[PDB]
Amino acid sequence: MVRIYTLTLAPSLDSATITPQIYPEGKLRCTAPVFEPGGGGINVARAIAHLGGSATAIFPAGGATGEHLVSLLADENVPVATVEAKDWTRQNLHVHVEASGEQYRFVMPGAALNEDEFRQLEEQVLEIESGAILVISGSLPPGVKLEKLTQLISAAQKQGIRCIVDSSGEALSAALAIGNIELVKPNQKELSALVNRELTQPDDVRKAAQEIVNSGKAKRVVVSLGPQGALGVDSENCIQVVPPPVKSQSTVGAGDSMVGAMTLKLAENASLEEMVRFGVAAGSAATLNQGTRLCSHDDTQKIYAYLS
Amino acid sequence: MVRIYTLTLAPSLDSATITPQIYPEGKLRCTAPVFEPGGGGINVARAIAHLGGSATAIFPAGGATGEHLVSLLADENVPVATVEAKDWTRQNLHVHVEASGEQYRFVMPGAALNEDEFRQLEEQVLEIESGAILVISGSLPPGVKLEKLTQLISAAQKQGIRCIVDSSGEALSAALAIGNIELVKPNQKELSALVNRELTQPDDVRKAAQEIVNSGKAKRVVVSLGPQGALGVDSENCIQVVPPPVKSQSTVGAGDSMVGAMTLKLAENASLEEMVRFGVAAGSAATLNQGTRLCSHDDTQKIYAYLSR
Amino acid sequence: MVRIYTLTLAPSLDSATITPQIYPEGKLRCTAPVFEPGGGGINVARAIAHLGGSATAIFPAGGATGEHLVSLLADENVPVATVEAKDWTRQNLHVHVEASGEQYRFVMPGAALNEDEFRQLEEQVLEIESGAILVISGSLPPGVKLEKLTQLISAAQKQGIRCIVDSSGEALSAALAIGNIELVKPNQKELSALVNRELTQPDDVRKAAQEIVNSGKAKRVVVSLGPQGALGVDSENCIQVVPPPVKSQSTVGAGDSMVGAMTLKLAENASLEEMVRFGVAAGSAATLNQGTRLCSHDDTQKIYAYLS
Amino acid sequence: MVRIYTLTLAPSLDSATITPQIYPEGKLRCTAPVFEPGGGGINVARAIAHLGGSATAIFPAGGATGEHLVSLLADENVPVATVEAKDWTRQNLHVHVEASGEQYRFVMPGAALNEDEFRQLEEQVLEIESGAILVISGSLPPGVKLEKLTQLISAAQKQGIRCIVDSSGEALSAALAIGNIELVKPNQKELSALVNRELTQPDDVRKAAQEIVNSGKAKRVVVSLGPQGALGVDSENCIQVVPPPVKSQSTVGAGDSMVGAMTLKLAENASLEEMVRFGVAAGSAATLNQGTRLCSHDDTQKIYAYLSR
Numbered sequence A, C: 001m002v003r004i005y006t007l008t009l010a011p012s013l014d015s016a017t018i019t020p021q022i023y024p025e026g027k028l029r030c031t032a033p034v035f036e037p038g039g040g041g042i043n044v045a046r047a048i049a050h051l052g053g054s055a056t057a058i059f060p061a062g063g064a065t066g067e068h069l070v071s072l073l074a075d076e077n078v079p080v081a082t083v084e085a086k087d088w089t090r091q092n093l094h095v096h097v098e099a100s101g102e103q104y105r106f107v108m109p110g111a112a113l114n115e116d117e118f119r120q121l122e123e124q125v126l127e128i129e130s131g132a133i134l135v136i137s138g139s140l141p142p143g144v145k146l147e148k149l150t151q152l153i154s155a156a157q158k159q160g161i162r163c164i165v166d167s168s169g170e171a172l173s174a175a176l177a178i179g180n181i182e183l184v185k186p187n188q189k190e191l192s193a194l195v196n197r198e199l200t201q202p203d204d205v206r207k208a209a210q211e212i213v214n215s216g217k218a219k220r221v222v223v224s225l226g227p228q229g230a231l232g233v234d235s236e237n238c239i240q241v242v243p244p245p246v247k248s249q250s251t252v253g254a255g256d257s258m259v260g261a262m263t264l265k266l267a268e269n270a271s272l273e274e275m276v277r278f279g280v281a282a283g284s285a286a287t288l289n290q291g292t293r294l295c296s297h298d299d300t301q302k303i304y305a306y307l308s
Numbered sequence B, D: 001m002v003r004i005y006t007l008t009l010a011p012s013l014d015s016a017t018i019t020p021q022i023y024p025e026g027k028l029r030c031t032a033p034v035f036e037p038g039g040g041g042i043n044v045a046r047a048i049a050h051l052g053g054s055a056t057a058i059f060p061a062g063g064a065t066g067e068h069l070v071s072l073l074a075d076e077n078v079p080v081a082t083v084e085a086k087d088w089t090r091q092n093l094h095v096h097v098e099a100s101g102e103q104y105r106f107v108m109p110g111a112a113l114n115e116d117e118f119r120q121l122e123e124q125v126l127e128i129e130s131g132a133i134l135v136i137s138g139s140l141p142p143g144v145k146l147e148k149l150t151q152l153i154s155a156a157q158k159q160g161i162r163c164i165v166d167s168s169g170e171a172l173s174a175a176l177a178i179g180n181i182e183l184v185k186p187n188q189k190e191l192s193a194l195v196n197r198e199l200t201q202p203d204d205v206r207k208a209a210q211e212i213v214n215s216g217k218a219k220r221v222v223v224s225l226g227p228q229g230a231l232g233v234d235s236e237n238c239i240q241v242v243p244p245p246v247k248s249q250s251t252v253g254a255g256d257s258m259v260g261a262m263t264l265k266l267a268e269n270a271s272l273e274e275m276v277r278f279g280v281a282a283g284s285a286a287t288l289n290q291g292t293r294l295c296s297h298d299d300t301q302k303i304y305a306y307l308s309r
Ligand SMILES: Nc1ncnc2c1ncn2[C@@H]1O[C@H](COP(=O)(O)OP(=O)(O)OP(=O)(O)O)[C@@H](O)[C@H]1O
Pocket: A021, A023, A024, A025, A026, A027, A028, C100, C102, D187, D189, D190
């Protein structure tokens, strides 16, 4: 099986804390936080480890927070390839409210990258051998021009690196600008922004996904639909996969779990149907767990057997 | 096509109001409320009218609020058959918050019913002709023992009335104890309570629905699954229908819209597939509208054509 | 001691209910409500009963909800004088959320009054003997022109009825338009709207209250200041009374409790200082109780002894 | 006038961000944060600068966040004396919600301190000259036994350093076990915990404060009462000062502003009355500003002149 790498230009060291109630104005006293790795490509690599594969996370790390992020990944046996950055690795906050069981997630931008740190990141990307898979996932941090992202993807593709993209906004449009992306996973809002129109008719999501494939921007578009599962589109096929009717506990990590699973199937040269089913299995398996926990192998396997 | 009736033991006159912000402790200044008909069977009858059918809503009404409830339905050209009750028709509250666009729904019990009044409602039901359809939908109000609900449904079936049930808790178990219910529509929570186990495995919902059909409790069970659509089960068939991937504006009225649609299909002697498809079409069409608005005919048709393509 | 009456043109039959959590979109299942009398003058009369006095509540009542409102007051031994109205007595909602201990209060307008029902209400007001006290408190319902309120107050004053006013907005301005009001109790926001300017300097509240007295609109202005107590102003005196440093549990009914207490002191021809102190004692005593419960005699007495 | 120092065992580099709405489950997109100095003693020193005085903030700083904390204070011309700590300076989060204008404050513990680092902080404190003032303010970080806080304050007093304490829980009890504290500023909750009883009667707060003075634990106790101002107690005097009736915009920084003000008055050997008046003036001036902004000189002066009229 081909090697798998992920790229996260905006990683984070996330804090998970607990407080008894939520209300404005006053000080909410929060428990000592539990630190967890954060960022699109980093979580894709973690999900892949859970599913029994291996993926190397490429990312910039800065300061004590960056060192702790790398430390956490080592304890999870997730291989990494890091670039030391000047700006310190930023922190997002996950707050669990005990009285209500609700969770609040505050997502701020990643640390800045200068031109030289991005150059070093691109250097690590181009050390990846031909045929191997690269998952570019997450937001675009300050300090990086959009064209630099497109140029990185072009350079990767020129030497046979197979690129998978999961992002949003201008970053997503830019990653698809040159085209020939192997797989892209917009959710519904992300798809709507990408094709720049509202998707209000029953057939709109399918047609918008097909329009992306037909343009040559992506060979495979998997539109993820939250509890409705996903719609996968090829030049030859359109497949909708709906999760089993089991209550979601928490949706955190659903997208990254789905992406890790589909990446593994892509690495196996699986059918589109098998890929999307395994993606829905993993994304929905992720929901079965409280808080930030990612998909487990056993839950994904069980849901996949049901979908099959 | 047969006549359709609905029964709502706990109707309400609902107030819908607007306020700029929501926070505790202080007085939230709310706009003069707009009043709307409330209650399971009442809303099923309203959805049926939106879909071009006709259904008579049977319910207790009391006091000035009850009079207004009745007046509102006449304005909507929904036929009613009412029993005057001693306890005044109760009110639920729907609050739209301007700053967030969020809606809050405070659902309180229906007015009390005494034994005489329930017997009067029973009398109305038994005036329904054989072969007609009766949809019993909504909560059980104070004053009514569960054994009386069982007796009403049993009495109604004795003379060829085809009963459809949508309820929850002990009222749903009581309504199904008789058996031979034409159709029951539990959502996932209601199904879990009905079979008294958590449904945590992928096939649990289907197996639970089949268990109800196989035991003889219901001829058809449609488990509605929110954005996932519905799973319909017969002695012969099992199907899941998922709605198209369109954004839900508001979920209020989804269940009652779905039940109204399935009831119309049942009246037409439709297949299980056609019935569940029309049900999901109507339920999901309801979601396309803001606030409490029920499914519209055109939106339901558009989704159904898609599901039928 | 002189007789005391209250007038409530917009009464309500309030529902108090409990639900385990609060969140939007879904159905919040609420317990069978406990019904309680509502409306400014009605609650002033209830507070007066708690403090050991007697006040007759004048108000319109309509439908089964109106009958239950009258029924509740009878069980509280609060004497009433009612006018049967066509429009049914409206309902406000008090929601207690079990998980957080928070309470949410949704206040909607009162029922409409037609010209003839208002005429009957005015008739009951003018049956009040000279020297007796009338507390006009609460919002103005639909169907009643502002001038009708001012004309009612004028007619009352012409036959020696001593008027106390607690209201807001255009209704408050109108009640003060003719002047010679015995006592008015705006809170800070209400004062600001009345004098039509923002009160941002340390001395502004005092000066605004004094400006009302000096204009002849009111003989006594007591500006209530929430946890800061109240500032009472006369032609000869300015007195600030601050409550004791005890935690407030719920603020519901604080204003009406204060008004009932000050009304009783006014009926006793008490000093301004004694009046304001007893008002703060009752308002703050009200806060000591959870939910909607009004001031108790024993708590008010205890706080009054402290203030003295 | 004597030199003023502050000690913050649990400093922070706080992030202030903005988001349009607050709701659970979904990702809330927050703006790139503005960083601000955090911590009790640190904020006391900042308020002192706003009021025209000078105070040296002593604290542990670690990692890049600690470097930024130090850099921010230098930009504000607040003198510091720091100990480099192994554990990186922690971050609290202040979230402004645009739709409601509300602010949410998530307060997490400070970075850990080992025994060596605390001894280094102790060394800094004992370099303070006799007769100077030290304000110990804020929470106790992980890694520090309560007996070490008691020892530091005892050691500091042994050589004429005048200690002012603002803290909570066991750290406050520990800080007062020594006795002869120049000034303590509990709020109502902190006072209740300190004397270990609910303060439910009108005179309970005054009696509790007097009990602390009379036992010798503190020379002055100022119980701060939020919008009700403060009650100040001496062996000789007892006074309550209530702020003017002006609307509070935001309460963040009220306590630290009040402590900074009272500290400056203590340095000037002011009367209890003048000290508490200036304290309430500064605390209430702080409330006049949005978000985290501390008291300003002019607003504090205006309120103080009013209180002094
Ligand atoms: N359970 C609650 N629900 C809603 N608001 C609350 C709640 N608890 C506190 N608040 C709000 O927070 C403000 C202050 O709360 P609190 O008593 O915790 O003081 P604080 O300043 O946050 O903390 P501290 O005791 O450390 O000084 C109150 O004025 C109130 O507005």
